[PDB]
Structures are given as C-alpha cells and as structure tokens.
C-alpha cells in the first residue's frame, strides 16, 4: 500500500553549501597545523629549551585533543518526524490503539534535598502525557524509603484526577501546572473552548491548595516522632529505617481502582522501595533502575522504557508519540536501542552566566554523534528497548542459561520473551504483588549478568555512559530526536559550586571508566563498534587528561614575565604568516562551526570560558584523585577546588605588574615582544574573569583559608622563580 | 476600621510584612512556607477589603482637596476645631484599645491615639522637636 | 526612466553588508601595509582608519544582526556579497 510504503521518519543530511567548506577547511587547518608543528619542532630556543619543550608538548596535545574533537563530526545531520503518519497508521480513529506499552521511570533519594513539590510536577506531567491510558505505566523508585514520599504521591494521585482531564480537555502545555501558571505568555492565545476561563481559575484554585497540602506535609514530616512514623491507618511505617528497610510496592491509579472528574481511567502510578539490608551494596542509581525494570517487567511489562530524572518533566506531550515514530519502524526499530532527547533547563540567567544551557555540544557534538552510530545516553529523557538492555544482539544488523543470566524468578523469565509487551497469558494476575517483590530482594543480584552485562551497568559514577557503550559495542544504533518543542525541561545549577561540583563528578567518572576494563581503547573489538563511535568513546573518556597541558600553558606567559624568556626565538615574516594564517583558519572554522550549527556568539565564548575554567580547576583534581587510587588508596562548598584558579589569575596579575615595571618604567628602549607576551596574559585572565568577577563581586563569597592559601603558594611561587 | 481585619490574618497566618501595600506588591512566591487550610480564600478575601480600602482612602483625599467656604465639618455637624493650621486647640483622640471595639476573631487591638498640639500665633512651635517632646 | 522592468527581501541588505565588509578588509590591508610592513612615517593613516570607523560605526547594526542572534540571512546572499567584495577588491588593487 502506498500509505505503508511511506516513513514514519526521515534523515535530512546538512545541505552540501553548507557542509562543503566545512569539510574543505577542516582539512585545511589540518594542513596548517602540521606546518605549524614543522616549524615550531625543528626550530627551538637556545637560552629557553626547557620553556620551548613545555610549550612544544603543550600544543602537541592541544593538536591531538582537536583532531580527536573534530574527526567525529564529519557528517552531522537532522531527523524529522511525521506524527500524522504514526496516527493514520496505529493510532486510526475508531479503531483500537494498537500503539505499544510505556514504562516511565522517575528514581528520588532523599525528600528532603530534593522538595517533593518537583516530583509531583513530574508526576503530575507524566500522567497527562497523550498516550492511551491502558498503554503507559509510571514507576517512582524512593531510595530514601521516607513516608514523605508515599504520602506527597497518594496527594498527586488526587490532584491528577483534576488536573488531567482539564488538560487534556484544553490541550494545556506544558502539562506541569507550576511551570503552566507561572508562564508569562499569553494563556487566551488559540484558546476556542467557551469554558476556559472558569475552569482554568478553579484549577488554579485547587492547584494553590494543593501546594499548601504539600507544603503542611512538608513541615508535619520535618522532625521524626519518637517511636517512629507512623501511617493513615494506624500501622507503622515499614522504612522507619532508611538502611535496613523490606520491599514495599504501592498502585495508586489505573486499571479497577478509581476514575477520574470525567469518569474515565488514569495512567497507573506504582511506588517502589527496594529491600535494603546492612552489609548490601546497594549500587544507588544503577541497582535502583535494575530493581525498577524487574518490577516493571513483572507487573506491566512494558517494551520500551523511558528514564525521567525528578527534577525533568516532561514538557511535550506529544514526546511518546515521537518515540513510537521511531520505536514501532518495522525496519529501524528493530536495531535501535534508545532514543535520546536534547537536555533544556528553566530558570537560567539571559547571559547564562555557568553555561548551563550547554549549546555548543547538545547541538554540534550531539548532532555530529547521530550521524554515525547514535548519540552518547546521557543524564535523563532517554527511550531504552528492553531487547537491548537484556543483553541480545541487533535483530537486524536453555532455561538454565537463562537462570544464569537474569535470576531466579520465572515469571520474570516468562515476561522477557514478550517481543510486544504485556503480561505473558501463562502467568496468574493473582500472583503478582509477590514476584515484584521477590524481584527486589536484595540478594537476587547473586550469580547473575545484572551490572555486568544486562541492565545498568555498575563500576562507574557515570553509568550512563557506560551502559551506552555497552549497547552500541553490540551493534545497536541510535538515533537523536530533536523535536520543534522540546520534549523534557530541568532545573539548571544555581551556582558556580555545584556546577564544579557536578563537572568533577563527571570528571571522576571518565577517569574511572578509563582505568576500568571497559575502556573503549581495549574493549569491544568485535567488529560491531564503528571507528568514529570508537574515536568519540575515546574522546569523552580522556577528555578531562588534558587538565595538564592548560595549567601549564596558562601558566607559562606569568613565568615569561618573571624570568625574561620567551618561547619564540626571534620574530619573522614567515613564523608571523604561520601564526596569522593559523589563528585565521581557527577563526574561520569556529564561524561556520556557529554557520552550520545555529549557535550564537554569546553562547558558544562563554562555552569556552567554562571549558577553559572547567579544565583548570576540576579536572585538574579529577587527575590527582585517579593518580592518588593508582599509586595509593587514599580519597576525599569544597574549598580547595578554586586554589589552582584563583592562584593562576593572581600569578598572571603579578607577572603583568612586575613585567610592566621592569621592562617599561626601568628599561624601556627596545622592550622587544611585550605586546604579545601581555596579549598571553590578558587571554588567560579573560579566559579565567568569571573568577575574579566573583570573588571581588557581589552575590558571591570566599572563606578566608582558601584565599590565605592561595596567596601564600602564589608568593611561594614567584620567590622560587624569581630566585632560580 | 481596616485594622479589626488586616490584624487578626496576620496574626494567623504570620504574614511579613505587616504593610499591605508592600505585602501585596511582592514577587516572592506567597504559598512558601505556608500550612495553614484556609490560606487562599482569606488571602483574596483580604486582598479584595484592602484594594476597597485603598479606593475609600482615595475618595477621602479627593473629596478633602478644595477647602469649604465656611471652613471644615465633621461627620456628626460640628465644625472641625483645626480649621486654622496656625490657631486651633489641643485634640486627643482615642480609637481602638481598651473597651472600644473588638476586631473579628473578638479580640481587642492596641491602642490608637491621635494628638495634635495646640498651636498659636506668636508661639514658636519647634516643629518635630518639640512635636516629640509633646 | 529608461525601460519598464519592476521587481524578506534578500537583495536589499547586500549594498550595505558589502560595503561594511569592503571597509574592513581595507582596514586589515591598511594596517597590514601602512605599519606591520612600512612603518616609519604611516601619516595620515590615523584619520584614514577613523573615518572607516565612522562608517563601521554607522553600520554596526547589520554586522550585529548577521553575527548575533534574533536575526538571520540566507547563505545566497551572504555568497553574492562576498563574491562582489571580492571582485571590487581584485579590481581596486589591478587598478
């Protein structure tokens, strides 16, 4: 049929006007480069050796970091969707939906640093996701096993009976009602109902006493009784202790339980606490998504999962649906493995003073990584096949081995062999609640593949990045979704502390994975990875390895300016042709890096300066942490991680005053190649500003010991090489 | 008058600032921190006397713009003893307090007392000073 | 006038974004032959580099639209005027 024969997708390749000279010079600063490292090798400094080696090593590994950054983007390209097809095709009016099931996966740990009024906007937006209520499941993981929890989601479940049908009714986005009230776009434009008005205040209404209940739950939770908590009914509370706790699963909606204002049905919301034990590495994040796959596929069984984090909600409703346009392809979805979503926050400053907004790789690294194999999985909005998370190959590229690889629990076994989902037809609905609870104990993870194989896997902080890995080492591919509206929004870092905390955390994780087996340098040769997926591994894990030649650099003009030396023999006409036709090609390829890839000028300098920040001061650390677990067994705001910064930035002012003394108020005459070797160091401070824009500015703060330390080591410094 | 119901909510609902004006002009998210069951509907409610409120206060600054022929009357017919800002007697006048009125939830509220020195020609007055000392 | 022939509008912006680039490659040849190479007595070329800069400076605004945001141009017409700079420029060094 014509109608069959047409995509549910399809791939735009970036135009060729536009992908040309990218290529052409892209090959050509290549050309440069290779000249460039000519010229600066067989030509040294006599009196400066030592500087010109430190410098000379320097470039060489700034050469290589930018040749394994630029060769995974040769061919990016676009993907578009078409949802009219995937209703004319699935979901025909009439007719039953024949669209597959969804499980929906949101992981809290602890209410009271994460504020429940969040997970209940994430709740409250997964709930009205435009999907057929009977084909999508919620699943809410609370590591922290707190009553707070239970009882702030038995309020959403009552809340979502108003709140869905209203938004369903007047086709509300985004469905989360404090980001919906709290827009300041015009709530009347396309508006045709007649009965908007009243119903949207009265649910606005009922929306602000709700966030008053909450609120009163909040604060009745803050302080825990003597004999424990306590429940509704008179029982006590099962998790009164946080590590030593058995297994509870709770189903507030759904099938049987209760309908809503309109007397239809509501998505089912299960809460789930594994069982946690003394003595039990629960492997947080990662143990927690296993346990909630298990349950899921126990209960629901579901045959896509997506990953929601508690502080994303998800801001398109239609967003399921663009999944399934991929997911149910007779042809494609067979061999993907996941959909990725781009990642958006709320909240963030104009000039997105953090780069919290991260343009610069969510819409070029991103982009050019769809167009080989499929993007990185990385943090949250993530469409995962259950085929792929349990270990098998690409379609379309025993029961005792089966015991050995997902665990004892047959009914599990029986519900993995669902290609379409659904609970298998050989299996008792009464006997349910008992497996899912069965399946979290803690000691199922025993002689089994759950870590190491299938599901998430352990041994590393990042396990995002692993699993994905894992996956593509297989022969999987994935795709990128970029919808018109973006499908999932967060909450951005407010301050700088987290942010650095956060890129350490990254940071570690990287390092761990490269000290791992799982290496991509070493691992997975089998023929399934591709070379340029291979060379992307490789850059995102050794990435944060080129902390060392920055600090150097950075350092190097300060030095230059306490000594007397310079790294350039002797200016001439051909190395200033070099250097100029080098900085020119660098210009150039950034502009059509911004030309292809839509990013302002703005957001891509203030994505380098927290490159810059970034690589001296957290990566630097990362580094020493590794070298430290290598050599030694020892391990760790926190107020050491700017002494390398904010003893660089004062190096560099102190180098700038003392060569400014010495060779204009004292020497003057032929000062020689000042101007430069000023122009290094006002390119490190501008690069290192943010620093001292917050240390001498407002609605910022430093404790005294850093500060004291970085100004004895910085003293320390320039008398040791003042003196040698 | 507007007292005996601005005094008693927030009271209750430990609402800071005590100005209404400042109070209802703030960005800061009002539900915050906020238990009590019956928030909302007081809130509108006393939103809704205060905006009344303003309007009367208004209407009385309009109304007292343009000074009366035969000078200034009170509201029961007896002329107003301050016509002349540079001659008039002592007035003490007490509003709320002990005995007087009770606000909504019964209570009684502190005492309001309007003084206004006597004034005459030839007298120099201090201004704020000796305002203070009386 | 003279014929009967008539016509966003991508034709409008190319006189002034190529003459806005016309001024700087001029501004980088100037300063390029006048001091990195000449030296000595450049002259009057502290006017000469002021005046391009009132110009630059009257024409800031479509150098910010074309590489700031909120904005936008075909790459048509980004070719045209770079390809008519860069025959203006060939034509006043030959000449």
């Given at each position: 049929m014509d109608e069959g024969r047409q995509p549910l997708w399809r791939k735009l390749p970036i135009s060729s006007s536009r992908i040309n000279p990218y290529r052409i010079i892209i090959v050509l600063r290549i050309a440069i480069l290779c000249l460039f490292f000519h010229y600066r090798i067989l030509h040294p400094v006599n009196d400066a050796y030592a500087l010109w080696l430190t410098s000379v090593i320097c470039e060489i590994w700034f050469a290589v970091s930018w040749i394994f950054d630029q060769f995974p983007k040769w061919s990016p390209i676009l993907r578009e969707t078409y949802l009219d097809r995937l209703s004319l095709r699935y979901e025909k009016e009439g007719?039953?939906?024949?669209?597959?099931?969804?499980?929906?996966?949101?992981?809290?740990?602890?209410?009271?640093?994460?504020?429940?009024?969040?997970?209940?906007?994430?709740?409250?937006?997964?709930?009205?996701?435009?999907?057929?209520?009977?084909?999508?499941?919620?699943?809410?993981?609370?590591?922290?096993?707190?009553?707070?929890?239970?009882?702030?989601?038995?309020?959403?479940?009552?809340?979502?009976?108003?709140?869905?049908?209203?938004?369903?009714?007047?086709?509300?986005?985004?469905?989360?009602?404090?980001?919906?009230?709290?827009?300041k776009v015009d709530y009347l434009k396309d508006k045709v109902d007649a009965t908007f008005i009243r119903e949207r205040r009265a649910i606005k209404r009922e929306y602000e006493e709700f966030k008053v209940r909450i609120n009163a739950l909040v604060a009745l939770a803050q302080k825990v009784p003597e004999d424990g908590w306590t429940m509704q009914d008179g029982t006590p509370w099962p998790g009164n202790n946080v590590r030593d706790h058995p297994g509870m699963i709770q189903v507030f909606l759904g099938q049987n339980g209760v309908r809503d204002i309109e007397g239809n049905e509501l998505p089912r919301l299960v809460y789930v606490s594994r069982e946690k034990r003394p003595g039990y590495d629960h492997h947080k994040k990662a143990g927690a998504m296993n346990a909630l796959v298990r349950v899921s596929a126990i209960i629901t069984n579901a045959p896509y999962v997506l990953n929601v984090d508690c502080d994303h909600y998800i801001n398109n409703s239609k967003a399921l649906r663009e999944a399934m346009c991929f997911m149910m392809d007779p042809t494609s979805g067979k061999k993907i493995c996941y959909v990725q979503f781009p990642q958006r926050f709320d909240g963030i400053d104009r000039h997105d003073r953090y780069s919290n907004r991260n343009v610069v790789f969510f819409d070029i690294n991103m982009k050019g990584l769809d167009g080989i194999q499929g993007p990185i999985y990385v943090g949250t909005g993530?469409?995962?096949?259950?085929?792929?998370?349990?270990?098998?190959?690409?379609?379309?590229?025993?029961?005792?081995?089966?015991?050995?690889?997902?665990?004892?629990?047959?009914?599990?076994?029986?519900?993995?062999?669902?290609?379409?989902?659904?609970?298998?037809?050989?299996?008792?609905?009464?006997?349910?609640?008992?497996?899912?609870?069965?399946?979290?104990?803690?000691?199922?993870?025993?002689?089994?593949?759950?870590?190491?194989?299938?599901?998430?896997?352990?041994?590393?902080?990042?396990?995002?990045?692993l699993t994905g890995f894992k996956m593509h080492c297989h022969g999987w591919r994935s795709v990128y979704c970029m919808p018109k509206r973006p499908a999932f929004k967060g909450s951005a870092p407010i301050n700088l502390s987290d942010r650095l905390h956060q890129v350490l955390r990254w940071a570690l994780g990287s390092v761990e994975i490269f000290f791992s087996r799982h290496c991509p340098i070493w691992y997975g040769y089998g023929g399934?990875?591709?070379?340029?997926?291979?060379?992307?591994?490789?850059?995102?894990?050794?990435?944060?390895?080129?902390?060392?030649?920055?600090?150097?650099?950075?350092?190097?003009?300060?030095?230059?300016?306490?000594?007397?030396?310079?790294?350039?023999?002797?200016?001439?006409?051909?190395?200033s042709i070099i250097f100029m036709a080098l900085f020119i090609s660098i210009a150039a390829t950034g502009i059509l890096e911004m030309q292809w890839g839509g990013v302002g000028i703005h957001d891509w300098w203030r994505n380098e300066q927290f490159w810059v920040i970034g690589g001296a001061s957290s990566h630097l650390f990362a580094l020493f942490q590794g070298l430290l677990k290598v050599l030694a067994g020892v391990n760790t705001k926190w107020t050491s991680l700017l002494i390398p910064p904010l003893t660089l930035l004062i190096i560099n002012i102190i180098g700038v005053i003392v060569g400014v003394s010495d060779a204009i108020n004292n020497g003057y005459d032929s000062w020689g190649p000042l101007f430069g070797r000023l122009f290094f160091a006002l390119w490190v401070i501008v690069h290192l500003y943010p620093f001292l824009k917050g240390v001498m500015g407002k609605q910022e703060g430093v404790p005294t010991i850093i500060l004291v330390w970085a100004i004895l080591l910085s003293s320390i410094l320039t008398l040791l090489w003042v003196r040698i």
């Open positions: 007719k039953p939906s024949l669209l597959a099931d969804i499980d929906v996966f949101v992981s809290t740990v602890d209410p009271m640093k994460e504020p429940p009024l969040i997970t209940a906007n994430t709740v409250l937006s997964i709930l009205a996701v435009d999907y057929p209520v009977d084909k999508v499941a919620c699943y809410v993981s609370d590591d922290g096993a707190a009553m707070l929890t239970f009882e702030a989601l038995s309020e959403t479940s009552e809340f979502a009976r108003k709140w869905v049908p209203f938004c369903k009714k007047f086709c509300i986005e985004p469905r989360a009602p404090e980001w919906y009230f709290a827009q993530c469409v995962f096949r259950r085929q792929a998370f349990y270990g098998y190959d690409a379609p379309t590229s025993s029961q005792s081995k089966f015991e050995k690889k997902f665990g004892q629990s047959s009914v599990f076994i029986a519900s993995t062999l669902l290609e379409d989902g659904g609970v298998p037809k050989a299996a008792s609905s009464a006997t349910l609640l008992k497996e899912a609870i069965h399946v979290i104990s803690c000691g199922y993870e025993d002689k089994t593949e759950w870590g190491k194989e299938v599901g998430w896997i352990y041994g590393s902080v990042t396990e995002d990045i399934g990875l591709k070379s340029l997926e291979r060379f992307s591994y490789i850059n995102s894990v050794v990435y944060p390895l080129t902390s060392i030649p920055l600090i150097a650099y950075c350092a190097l003009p300060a030095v230059c300016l306490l000594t007397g030396k310079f790294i350039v023999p002797e200016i001439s006409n051909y190395a």
